[PDB]
Subunit: 257 residues, 2 copies
DNA sequence: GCGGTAGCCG
DNA sequence: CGGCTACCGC
């Protein structure tokens, strides 16, 4: 079996007490991480090596930042989109254990009336052309990450109220779904269709977990031949309940490979 | 037995992971704290209550701040000196288990040539008069705190280097010793008159403990009849080695009463 | 809320 | 080094 996970860590240097024990327990083949919030020269790579994980990383000071930890040595590592602004701190790609892995931290967008929202839409359009150009859909590939898009009403707690939210607004949803149409399968919905499963609970929301006030903007998207072999996918609530948790949960997929 | 401790905590809300386990393990009758750095309405009372400790506290935002935790309910609680500026955030006094407890965070002084050092000197003069007026030296009383004064050469690592340091300058030493000559016994020196023992190691001095690069500016001072019963007094080095420690060490005195 | 940033400070 | 005052981002 092959296990691939994705996890927005909200600062890797402030989350090793979660990530390292979680890797020891769950032993995924590949863990994609977002919002590492660290410059490359300060990335805590030794902490991963000591538990038998390779780790590749791309980030700048204070914000954004992406990394992939793996049991097998990553090859053919690249950073960013292939056009300006490259945003190396938002996209890291590698061939790992025969899998083409693309890990994205999509711009969140701030508010729909902002320049940042237009930048998010443009990023999703650029990502479309990037993946159309570079992904072999007859091969095993996974596009993982924190997409900052909840594509269907089941992916948000209150679809009726969130029409103007940057993570649920129609333009972002349409742009994200345009990429899925290339032939990515949202494996969470292969296994758990139409089921309230959230990968994010806002720190600011009192009792968020207990009252089900979450979002599902994180995804593992697999090419058709890999998706066909997906036998499980779930969000792990345990690290979200631990002391000093990330606001996101890991999302885990298991393939019959 | 009766156990009394003093501990400069460098922000109580940042030090509960040290202080609460420390109380549970050491079970002192009285713990005086300095540099709590918290306004009264935000003092973490419940943390002490849930381990069976009373706590009384006096402080404003971000600087200074004093508190006393005790097994027995404090009585006749007062804040500050009895003259303007009162500095309620630098003195808290209470009758606890029949003992008159005075907890001070003496002005540090900054530099020898500054208005702040003058303020430190007049504060010590004011404290002399306050204690002379209000302490019965026939009764059980303890004056403890972070005095920001190392009275003798044994109390500092480099007496020569530090002649003009605010915590070891002759003016502050004589002002402090003037208070002691009222009848206060520095119990650390009753038990360990000749030992190099420190209650502070600067965070910035790498290897300070091994290198003996410490200061002893914290004290537990007892009236003669209480002092006569002192059987032990030591600084606890263990919490100084802990993750995210205070820069100061708990100073502990035990009395056979 | 709770990550990050900078400069101030002992 | 690790508190503070502030701010910034999600």
């Amino acid at each position: 079996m092959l296990k691939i996970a994705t996890f927005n860590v909200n600062s890797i240097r402030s989350r090793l007490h979660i990530v390292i024990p979680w890797l020891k327990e769950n032993k995924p083949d590949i863990l994609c991480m977002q919002e590492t919030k660290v410059e490359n020269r300060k990335f805590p790579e030794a902490d991963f090596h000591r538990i038998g994980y390779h780790v590749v990383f791309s980030g700048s000071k204070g914000r954004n930042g992406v990394a992939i930890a793996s049991l097998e040595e990553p090859e053919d590592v690249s950073f960013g989109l292939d056009s300006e602004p490259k945003d190396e701190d938002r996209l890291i790609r590698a061939k790992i254990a025969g899998i083409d892995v693309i890990n994205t931290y999509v711009p969140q967008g701030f508010k729909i009336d902002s320049e940042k929202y237009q930048y998010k839409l443009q990023w999703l359009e650029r990502l479309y052309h990037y993946l159309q150009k570079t992904v072999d859909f007859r091969s095993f590939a996974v596009w993982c990450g924190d997409m900052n898009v909840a594509p269907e009403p089941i992916d948000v707690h209150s679809p009726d109220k969130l029409k103007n939210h940057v993570c649920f607004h129609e333009d972002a949803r349409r742009a994200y779904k345009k990429i899925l149409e290339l032939g990515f399968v949202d494996v969470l919905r292969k296994i758990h269709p139409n089921e309230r499963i959230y990968t994010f609970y806002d720190y600011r929301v009192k009792g968020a977990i207990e009252r089900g006030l979450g979002w599902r903007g994180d995804a593992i998207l697999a090419t058709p031949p890999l998706a066909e072999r997906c036998v499980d996918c779930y969000a792990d609530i345990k690290p979200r309940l631990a002391e000093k948790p990330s606001d996101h949960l890991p999302l885990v997929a298991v393939f019959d490979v």
